[PDB]
Amino acid sequence: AMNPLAQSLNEQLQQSNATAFAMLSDLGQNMFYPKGILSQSAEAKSTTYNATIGMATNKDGKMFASSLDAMFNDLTPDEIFPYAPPQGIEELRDLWQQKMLRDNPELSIDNMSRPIVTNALTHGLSLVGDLFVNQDDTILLPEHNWGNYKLVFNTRNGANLQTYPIFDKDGHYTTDSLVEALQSYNKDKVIMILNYPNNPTGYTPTHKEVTTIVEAIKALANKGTKVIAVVDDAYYGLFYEDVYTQSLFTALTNLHSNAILPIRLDGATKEFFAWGFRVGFMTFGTSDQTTKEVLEAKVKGLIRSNISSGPLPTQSAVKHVLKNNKQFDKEIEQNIQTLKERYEVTKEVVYADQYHSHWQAYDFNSGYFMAIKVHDVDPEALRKHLIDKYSIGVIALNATDIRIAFSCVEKDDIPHVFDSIAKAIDDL
Amino acid sequence: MNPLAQSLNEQLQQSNATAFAMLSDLGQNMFYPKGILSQSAEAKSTTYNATIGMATNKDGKMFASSLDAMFNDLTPDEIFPYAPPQGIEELRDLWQQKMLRDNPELSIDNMSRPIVTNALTHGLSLVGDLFVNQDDTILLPEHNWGNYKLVFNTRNGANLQTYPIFDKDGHYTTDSLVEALQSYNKDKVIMILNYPNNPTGYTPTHKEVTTIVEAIKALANKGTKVIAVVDDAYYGLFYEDVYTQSLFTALTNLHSNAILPIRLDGATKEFFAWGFRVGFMTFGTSDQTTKEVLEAKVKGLIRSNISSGPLPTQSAVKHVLKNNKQFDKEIEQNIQTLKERYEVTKEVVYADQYHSHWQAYDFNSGYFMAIKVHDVDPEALRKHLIDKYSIGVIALNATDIRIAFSCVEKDDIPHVFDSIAKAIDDLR
Ligand SMILES: [Mg+2]
């Protein structure tokens, strides 16, 4: 019961990129983007009297309530009320690609698809699940990770999560355990999640470390394992030290292996301080035109059959600020500088000699968060005590670790927060 | 299966075994995580909340003034932060209030609190996730929206079974639905009820709704579990004396545990806000446990798919629900415009001069009407209308075309149908 259109797409992808086809889930194979009506509706645009549009319109555009239109500035009614395409507003796709190219000097436009707009990064992850993750596939990811990966990939998609450490005994970042995991990996397919800056540790690797990671992934690919390399760039750009500042997507795409499919998920969510906008992007690392076209068709079908399309007003808002808007650039830079100064205070406080008996920080240099391994006490007992007595909210990640978001603590408040954590530990 | 899902399932089984029996495999496995989310809500009343995955300062969330400048009347905390996965709680309340106002025979005790979705398609997708197994059957009219197939067949692997809703003479009939329900031979069905209809613009009378819901009750009592999806995309766009409550109300008032009504409605068409992506999902049940378990599972489904929906458009819909006087008048005017176009369409479609050209399917609502064209192929007609007459219409099937008066000014409608008649004569 596969649609002829899906079969057509599959055959084209098989001829041009058999490994990419082999990576598709069952849903991935069955998906396509329907013609018929869209083509009919498209053909109607050349007519004086277009009676095909499923929206209320009149002589000068869409019908709308002026009272709703009044809640926006700088956007035309056509940038607010109509449907966005399932793939997102085409201009936005262009402008976001331009931004990526600016941020990633070593990335070539020929080596990627045009970014497709998603309902932010979670939707991107869900789309990866739809398109490439079968029940009982394996997700390979650090033991320090975002809890929603499990709900997306295990609970929704039926995959297994296999974890590997990314910090050693002394709380310092290490690639050794990833390399060991890749060397022992015994299946013909893996989906890897790479999230740097990291939630929950706020670590971004050095170029040295990135090289090691991507060379290790290439070695796995060459052993006969197909690698879907999901690059979760939620905190991209929030870099406070001399680290690798391109996306790992670029490093991975520049390997030029047909057995590795890099997928970049990025967006406005944290980069543009726009969490509720729900504007993100999905980009494939491939130089093959057919692959680009078939994957775009399938993603369009996946989006159409899930949410139809994303929010036009917030897509339009993001589109506008991408057009070399120097004021917006400065505002983002200011905001990131605030985070960097908070990071700097956090570094000075967390590594002070007086707290060496209280915790061991995991390396951090980016993002929103850092984590500490609390000594001789339960992180859960510590958390509730901090809420009850000190009026401080922290996250207990696991049996040993606490996460603190310096993203929501003012610079002047940070020493108090950490000193209160140390006192709270000493209490128990 | 996660322990939390097992917990929810056991509670549902004890309180509403049939509702549990309706769940898909995904539906059974879903839950809403505690862990890190629970820890965050416990710290909401802390002075220093360092658990939030956002950037904040003393004033509230951090943001770019250039983006904030694109909105009026909304505060930044109504624009930039995350919405909850279930939607802004105030919006849920206000929409429920609207539903109650629109549906006098609906009791607040007999429904869940509406959950916000990314408009109605997301609602349909969620029904698919939660209740549709591969090879389940969707029972729906043969006149239907093409995306139902992509959502339920292509994405979810269900079969569509159609039944006619118009007789020989283009007149609406419940006879074929009753016949279909009497012969239906499986233990589960997912029905889709879409009135006003796409593509025919028909809404049934009180009389007809009674027949429909009595027939569905009879099927339920034979031992078939009925998920009754009420697609209210065009709700409120009523131009004749028809049933003006949602069919959700009629179905909920049956009080059968073997029928689970699910209402999908939203701002999309009701508020002339297609690109906003604000819709709602409501369950027809009087059982508190059912309400809580289904909400938990839907939250998990949303969290693992899109995370959350767009805050700015949710906040906008909230605002026009609260500050409503002017907005309500503007919407009323737009609907009056649609009514007048309908009235012209009726006057013209049934004029004697066109008796040989087509047979209209009954219509009284929404955006569209359909005609059965005499003696000519709709596709050939559609192409010829574009080429010679500069008229754009949709060819639905082997005999019918759809005309959207939603996008044709009142004074141009007679010309459109004049040209359709002329084009038909050209081809026969
Ligand atoms: Mg999958």
PDB file of C-alpha atoms in Angstrom, chain A residues 22-23 25 128-129 132-142 149-150 152-154 157-164 178 181-182 184-194 220 225-230:
ATOM      1  CA  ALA A  22      19.032   2.380   3.556  1.00  0.00           C
ATOM      2  CA  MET A  23      18.944   4.822   6.512  1.00  0.00           C
ATOM      3  CA  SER A  25      12.695   4.150   8.594  1.00  0.00           C
ATOM      4  CA  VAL A 128      14.799  12.747  12.449  1.00  0.00           C
ATOM      5  CA  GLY A 129      12.863  10.105  14.452  1.00  0.00           C
ATOM      6  CA  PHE A 132      15.442   7.686  10.064  1.00  0.00           C
ATOM      7  CA  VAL A 133      14.673   5.919  13.363  1.00  0.00           C
ATOM      8  CA  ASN A 134      13.115   2.469  13.347  1.00  0.00           C
ATOM      9  CA  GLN A 135      11.896   0.677  16.439  1.00  0.00           C
ATOM     10  CA  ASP A 136      14.960  -0.980  18.047  1.00  0.00           C
ATOM     11  CA  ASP A 137      17.480   1.307  16.303  1.00  0.00           C
ATOM     12  CA  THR A 138      20.201   2.614  18.619  1.00  0.00           C
ATOM     13  CA  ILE A 139      20.720   6.238  19.629  1.00  0.00           C
ATOM     14  CA  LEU A 140      24.354   6.742  20.689  1.00  0.00           C
ATOM     15  CA  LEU A 141      24.772   9.787  22.940  1.00  0.00           C
ATOM     16  CA  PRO A 142      26.640  11.121  26.001  1.00  0.00           C
ATOM     17  CA  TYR A 149      15.931  12.759  23.859  1.00  0.00           C
ATOM     18  CA  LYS A 150      14.595   9.637  25.615  1.00  0.00           C
ATOM     19  CA  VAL A 152      11.443  11.508  21.553  1.00  0.00           C
ATOM     20  CA  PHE A 153      13.531   8.525  20.519  1.00  0.00           C
ATOM     21  CA  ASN A 154      12.701   5.756  23.017  1.00  0.00           C
ATOM     22  CA  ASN A 157      10.083   6.077  18.228  1.00  0.00           C
ATOM     23  CA  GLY A 158      10.896   2.844  20.099  1.00  0.00           C
ATOM     24  CA  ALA A 159      14.686   3.173  19.812  1.00  0.00           C
ATOM     25  CA  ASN A 160      17.269   2.133  22.448  1.00  0.00           C
ATOM     26  CA  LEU A 161      19.583   4.714  23.991  1.00  0.00           C
ATOM     27  CA  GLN A 162      23.225   3.711  24.461  1.00  0.00           C
ATOM     28  CA  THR A 163      25.249   6.166  26.521  1.00  0.00           C
ATOM     29  CA  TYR A 164      28.961   6.888  26.799  1.00  0.00           C
ATOM     30  CA  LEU A 178      33.356   7.942  22.676  1.00  0.00           C
ATOM     31  CA  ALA A 181      32.201   3.121  22.142  1.00  0.00           C
ATOM     32  CA  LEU A 182      32.616   3.600  18.370  1.00  0.00           C
ATOM     33  CA  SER A 184      33.143  -1.685  19.932  1.00  0.00           C
ATOM     34  CA  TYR A 185      29.887  -0.666  18.208  1.00  0.00           C
ATOM     35  CA  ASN A 186      28.445  -3.817  16.633  1.00  0.00           C
ATOM     36  CA  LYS A 187      25.372  -2.821  14.575  1.00  0.00           C
ATOM     37  CA  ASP A 188      24.987  -1.805  10.903  1.00  0.00           C
ATOM     38  CA  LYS A 189      23.291   1.519  11.751  1.00  0.00           C
ATOM     39  CA  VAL A 190      23.584   4.112  14.492  1.00  0.00           C
ATOM     40  CA  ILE A 191      21.941   7.444  15.168  1.00  0.00           C
ATOM     41  CA  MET A 192      24.369   9.696  17.042  1.00  0.00           C
ATOM     42  CA  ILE A 193      23.353  12.828  18.914  1.00  0.00           C
ATOM     43  CA  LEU A 194      26.040  15.482  19.312  1.00  0.00           C
ATOM     44  CA  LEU A 220      33.092   3.609  12.252  1.00  0.00           C
ATOM     45  CA  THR A 225      28.029   1.130   9.960  1.00  0.00           C
ATOM     46  CA  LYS A 226      25.679   3.743   8.493  1.00  0.00           C
ATOM     47  CA  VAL A 227      25.847   6.837  10.718  1.00  0.00           C
ATOM     48  CA  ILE A 228      23.078   9.402  11.091  1.00  0.00           C
ATOM     49  CA  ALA A 229      24.908  12.181  12.919  1.00  0.00           C
ATOM     50  CA  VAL A 230      22.402  14.518  14.519  1.00  0.00           C
TER      51      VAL A 230
END
